[PDB]
Amino acid sequence: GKITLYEDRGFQGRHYECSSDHPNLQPYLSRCNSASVDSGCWMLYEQPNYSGLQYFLRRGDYADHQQWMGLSDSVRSCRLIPHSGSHRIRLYEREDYRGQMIEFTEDCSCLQDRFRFNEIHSLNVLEGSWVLYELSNYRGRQYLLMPGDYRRYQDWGATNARVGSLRRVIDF
C-alpha cells in the first residue's frame, strides 16, 4: 500500500507519504484536506492511535475531505487494511450471537432490505475485513471490522447498534 496525505485541498500543501500503518501523524501533518491512494485500502482516523471517527479509502484521489465523508480535516493516524482473499460476516439480532442471524459474502447497500432490524447487537467476522456503516448506502459513521468475534456493538467502537450498510474491503 501507498497513500499520500495533503494538508490542503486539491493535493496542495505539506504532504506525507505512508506505506504502512502510522499511529501518529501529528508531527508530520497538522491537518488533512486531500489524499491520493496509489494502492491498498486505508482507514483514516480522526485521532492518534486508530481512535475517533474512521474513514475508509481505496485506490483513488480525494480532492477534499468530504470525498471520504470526513466531518473535519483532522486525520491523526491511518491504517493499511490487510488484504483478504475472501469475505464472510454474520450479523445477529441480539448480543452474544443470539437471535436471528444473516450471513453475507458480498456488499449490502441496505441492510434493512435483507434483514429487518435497525440494530445489530453482535456479529461474527469469519473472513475478510469489512466496513460497517451506520446508514444505508454507505453513509454515516464507519467502523472497520477485522476478522474476529464481536459479542456487542461496543466491540466495534460504536456508541449504538445502528447499522444500515456493510462493505467488503477489497483493493480493486
Author numbering: 1 to 172
Question: Which lines from the publication concern this structure?
Answer:
The high expression levels contribute to the refractive index within the lens which focuses visible light upon the retina. In order to observe structural changes in HGD, we take advantage of an arginine-to-serine point mutation, R36S, first identified in congenital cataracts (HGDm).
The room-temperature serial synchrotron crystallographic (SSX) structure of freshly prepared crystallin mutant (R36S) shows no post-translational modifications. Here, we present crystal structures of freshly prepared HGDm (fresh dataset), HGDm aged for 9 months in dark conditions (aged dataset), and similarly aged HGDm during exposure to UV (light dataset). Crystals were prepared with 20 mM dithiothreitol (DTT), a sulfur-containing reducing agent with a similar function to that which GSH is expected to perform in vivo. In our structures, the fresh HGDm crystals incurred an average diffraction-weighted dose (DWD)28 of 0.19 MGy after 20 ms X-ray exposure. The solvent accessibility and pKa of the three surface cysteine residues were calculated from the fresh structure using PropKa331 and PyPka32.
